[PDB]
Amino acid sequence: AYYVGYLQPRTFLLKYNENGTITDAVDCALDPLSE
Amino acid sequence: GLKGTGVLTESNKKFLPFQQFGRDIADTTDAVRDPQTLEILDITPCSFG
């Protein structure tokens, strides 16, 4: 099975760790808790 | 092309193999890759007060 998504102009708050690896993110237009 | 002033000490930063610049809290470049030897070098501005 193969999966196709589509890209939208969207703001994220990226959680960089101490090693420089993005470990988590918040989709800033998902829900009002994310805002 | 990245112009700046500071001391070029050893960074001790674990860059990913594609990464070239290091930023910490702002638009300043905290760490930079050497273009020739690929050693990761810190940028600390010269001592002030």
Resolution of the determined structure in angstroms stands at: 2.8
B13 contacts in chain A (CB < 8 Å): 20
**Residues B33, B20 contacting (CB under 8 angstroms):** yes
CB contact under 8 A, B19 and A20: yes
Nearest residue in chain A measured CA to CA from B13:
A19
Pairwise CA distance, residues A20 & B48, whole Å: 29
CB of A18 closer than 8 Å to CB of B17: no
Alpha-carbon torsion (A21, B27, B43, B49), positive or negative: negative
Q: Which two tokens stand for residue A4?
A: 């196709």
Tokens 């070239």 belong to: B20
- CA dist B2 and B30 (Å) reads 12
* A1: closest CA of chain B, how far (Å): 30
Experimental method: cryo-EM
